[PDB]
Design a protein around this nucleic acid. Structure first.
Ligand SMILES: [Mg+2]
Ligand SMILES: [Mg+2]
Ligand SMILES: [Mg+2]
Ligand SMILES: [Mg+2]
Ligand SMILES: [Mg+2]
Ligand SMILES: [Mg+2]
Ligand SMILES: [Mg+2]
Ligand SMILES: [Mg+2]
Ligand SMILES: [Mg+2]
Ligand SMILES: [Mg+2]
Ligand SMILES: [Mg+2]
Ligand SMILES: [Mg+2]
Ligand SMILES: [Mg+2]
Ligand SMILES: [Mg+2]
Ligand SMILES: [Mg+2]
Ligand SMILES: [Mg+2]
Ligand SMILES: [Mg+2]
Ligand SMILES: [Mg+2]
Ligand SMILES: [Mg+2]
Ligand SMILES: [Mg+2]
Ligand SMILES: [Mg+2]
Ligand SMILES: [Mg+2]
Ligand SMILES: [Mg+2]
Ligand SMILES: [Mg+2]
Ligand SMILES: [Mg+2]
Ligand SMILES: [Mg+2]
Ligand SMILES: [Mg+2]
Ligand SMILES: [Mg+2]
Ligand SMILES: [Mg+2]
Ligand SMILES: [Mg+2]
Ligand SMILES: [Mg+2]
Ligand SMILES: [Mg+2]
Ligand SMILES: [Mg+2]
Ligand SMILES: [Mg+2]
Ligand SMILES: [Mg+2]
Ligand SMILES: [Mg+2]
Ligand SMILES: [Mg+2]
Ligand SMILES: [Mg+2]
Ligand SMILES: [Mg+2]
Ligand SMILES: [Mg+2]
Ligand SMILES: [Mg+2]
Ligand SMILES: [Mg+2]
Ligand SMILES: [Mg+2]
Lengths: 66, 110, 119, 56, 94, 46
RNA sequence: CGAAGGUGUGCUGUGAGGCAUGCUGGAGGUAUCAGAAGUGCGAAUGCUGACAUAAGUAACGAUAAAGCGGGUGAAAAGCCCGCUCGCCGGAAGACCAAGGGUUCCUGUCCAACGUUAAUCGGGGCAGGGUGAGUCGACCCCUAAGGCGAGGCCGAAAGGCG
RNA sequence: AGGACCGAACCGACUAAUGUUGAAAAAUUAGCGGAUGACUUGUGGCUGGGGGUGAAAGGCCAAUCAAACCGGGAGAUAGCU
């Protein structure tokens, strides 16, 4: 709304607004936040999840191995 | 005198855009704009807005006559791929790719 | 296979098709021109044009039939008071399909279907 | 149900050989307004085969 | 007797708002931003002394601070306290 | 399904909170390890 | 008056290699003879990052269902208004506790998010909003149980009370 | 009256189909058993790893159990790949 007012003049009701904070490279920054956040996650996920693969084991690999 | 217009970081696949870009290679711009007008793909909206920008740049900055203009070079490059995580079953994660493009339209009197 | 058959399924069940063409026929009688898809317009001709041929003979029974088909007394009144004598001489073909391009959301081929004696 | 060797870019191009789009051949021209449209479609202004079928 | 120095440090600012203007013109109630540790008796004594005006009742509420993001760094604004001070009828204030 | 984390702040603070750590000897060693490592949130306690 | 590095070319040596030079690059490099090594990678279901492939394929998350007119807008299957249709109705309605913690309301924006578009949004940005002697907590009271002055016990820590 | 009967809530999980890179790291649909009792549920509490608890299947103890998890001894050892 006000980019980032370095400060907002209430004397009148305007604002001096320098920072690119909220710019599209800031938007790429939040993209990065979520980016590497999810990546760490993805890794830990396929870590803690893909465990219970039956891999033919519970009913076919079993009978094979006998 | 060649005139370039680019839509960098085009939010679209290069494969999906090259289908449209192969329709207007070497054509007159009035024919390429009518083809892109009556092509129903989204990439036709992108490459039409780029061809219109190349026409206006050739007219303003270069004095080129519009009836003599011709799409001499057009090519789509791969852009940066933003990457998102889509969850699948059993806790498995897949990293989808959200492709971008760099559309380039070169128009000239040649 | 679809040998010698008729009627479009339109990815709907039978009650949805019947209620959709009942609404669309009432909207076409109400406004005399609508913009829908070309398949729905082509299947709508087989709904609206029998209502007008029914509306050419203003009886109480035919008012009740048109009410059982449309379920709108305003539509039945416009059918028997205006479009009956308006189309009293035409041997069918009471409407017109005008293809109007492609819908932006799904590239669906759209069409304007209007009555003939509109303008 | 999955490959055993990586298919080449040659096979990829040969599979995409038929995925090319067909451009529209010729745009029909309205006889009254003189503007171009699809054959058997109405114009953007609402003309078709001369008459103004719908205002806008 | 509440000390005058505390009474000078209790009140922070008037609160401008559509609700504050409505309560001011209808219920004759001003809306003040006050110090967070300030109680109702300290507020009633401060308005009755520093403005020399008759307070009927004081209702208070605590405003929780919002969570903002300057750029991409997260941050949280301060909790502040809000007082609805109902003046008696006939009393007037700038 | 019913998953293993059904939160309750009272039980969270009685089990893992500050005074529950400071009560015993080994719990005080937990807070000494987190200060040496430099944790921002030293405990659960809000 | 163009270093390292990168990219070519030409020449040369039995080889690991070497030399010259064009372009880029724009500030360091280093002979010889000795010395010391984190000294040479294609493989280790090697580690980290990037990019392919399958492939523009599968899928787009309950088979409760949508149709039209008008509006806004750069643009409307999805937004708003309206008329119809359908669904729940011991719930798919309403009120709370626990839990979350501003997701509430208004204005504005559409990059990202939303499994499509989006003018819309629990999204971004700014502002506003929660008012109690009686509601609840706090508070008085205790249960299971916990802690526990002294105390008893125990190498110490500590255990019980 | 009833560890009585039929049957919703509620608790459970006998059969089939689907699904098996799922809507879901155990579920949905159609049926199914108990349903005033050795019932079920909320909140809080207690029992700690060769230990608990167990109408007893080596079952359960945070998606982990013929001895949990975390850190450390620790670069255990590996006549093996
Ligand atoms: Mg899951
Ligand atoms: Mg036929
Ligand atoms: Mg379909
Ligand atoms: Mg039926
Ligand atoms: Mg092989
Ligand atoms: Mg193909
Ligand atoms: Mg209060
Ligand atoms: Mg040079
Ligand atoms: Mg070099
Ligand atoms: Mg060089
Ligand atoms: Mg150096
Ligand atoms: Mg080495
Ligand atoms: Mg080797
Ligand atoms: Mg390797
Ligand atoms: Mg592909
Ligand atoms: Mg295939
Ligand atoms: Mg297929
Ligand atoms: Mg499909
Ligand atoms: Mg859906
Ligand atoms: Mg509409
Ligand atoms: Mg819809
Ligand atoms: Mg509506
Ligand atoms: Mg119903
Ligand atoms: Mg019912
Ligand atoms: Mg927020
Ligand atoms: Mg809202
Ligand atoms: Mg957009
Ligand atoms: Mg989108
Ligand atoms: Mg929001
Ligand atoms: Mg009390
Ligand atoms: Mg007490
Ligand atoms: Mg006691
Ligand atoms: Mg003692
Ligand atoms: Mg004790
Ligand atoms: Mg019984
Ligand atoms: Mg069942
Ligand atoms: Mg029973
Ligand atoms: Mg056994
Ligand atoms: Mg377990
Ligand atoms: Mg053990
Ligand atoms: Mg053991
Ligand atoms: Mg050792
Ligand atoms: Mg080892």
């Amino acid at each position: 709304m006000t980019g980032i007012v370095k400060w907002f003049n209430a004397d009148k009701g305007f604002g001096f607004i320098t920072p690119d904070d909220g710019s599209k490279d800031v938007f790429v920054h939040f993209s990065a936040i979520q980016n590497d956040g999810y990546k760490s996650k993805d890794e830990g996920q396929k870590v803690s999840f893909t465990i219970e693969s039956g891999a033919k084991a519970p009913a076919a690999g079993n009978v094979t191995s006998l | 005198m060649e005139t370039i217009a680019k839509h960098r970081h085009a939010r679209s696949s290069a494969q999906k855009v090259r289908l449209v870009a192969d329709l207007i290679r070497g054509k007159k711009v009035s024919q390429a704009l009518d083809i892109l007008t009556y092509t129903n793909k989204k990439a036709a909206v992108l490459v039409k807005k780029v061809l219109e920008s190349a026409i206006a740049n050739a007219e303003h900055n270069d004095g080129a006559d519009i009836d003599d203009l011709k799409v001499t070079k057009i090519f789509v490059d791969e852009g940066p791929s933003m990457k998102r995580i889509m969850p699948r079953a059993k806790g498995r994660a897949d990293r989808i790719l959200k492709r971008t493009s760099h559309i380039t339209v070169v128009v000239s009197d040649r | 296979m679809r040998h010698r058959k008729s009627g479009r399924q339109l990815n709907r069940n039978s009650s949805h098709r019947q209620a959709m063409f009942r609404n669309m026929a009432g909207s076409l009688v109400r406004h005399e021109i609508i913009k829908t898809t070309l398949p729905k317009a082509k299947e709508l001709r087989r709904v609206v044009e029998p209502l007008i041929t029914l509306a050419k003979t203003d009886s109480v029974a035919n008012r009740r039939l048109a009410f059982a088909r449309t379920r709108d007394n305003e539509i039945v009144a416009k059918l028997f008071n205006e479009l009956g004598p308006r189309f009293a001489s035409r041997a069918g073909g009471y409407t017109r399909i005008l293809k109007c391009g492609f819908r932006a959301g799904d590239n669906a081929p759209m069409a304007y279907i209007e009555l003939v004696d509109r303008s | 149900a999955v490959q055993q060797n990586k298919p080449t870019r040659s096979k990829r191009g040969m599979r995409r050989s038929h995925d090319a789009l067909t451009a529209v051949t010729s745009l029909s021209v309205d006889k009254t307004s003189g503007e171009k449209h699809l054959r058997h479609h109405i114009t953007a202004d609402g003309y078709y085969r001369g008459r103004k079928v719908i205002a806008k | 007797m509440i000390r005058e120095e505390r009474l000078l440090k209790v009140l922070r600012a008037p609160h401008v708002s559509e609700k504050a203007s409505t309560a001011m013109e209808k219920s004759n109630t001003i809306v003040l931003k006050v110090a967070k540790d300030a109680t109702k008796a300290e507020i009633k004594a401060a308005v009755q002394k520093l403005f020399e005006v008759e307070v009927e009742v004081v209702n208070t509420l605590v405003v929780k601070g919002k969570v903002k993001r300057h750029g991409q760094r997260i941050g949280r604004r301060s909790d502040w306290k809000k007082a609805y001070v109902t003046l008696k009828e006939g009393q007037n204030l700038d | 399904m019913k998953r293993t984390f059904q939160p309750s702040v009272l039980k969270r603070n009685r089990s893992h909170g500050f005074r529950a750590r400071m009560a015993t000897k080994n719990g005080r060693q937990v807070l000494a390890r987190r200060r040496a490592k430099g944790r921002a949130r030293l405990t659960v306690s809000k």
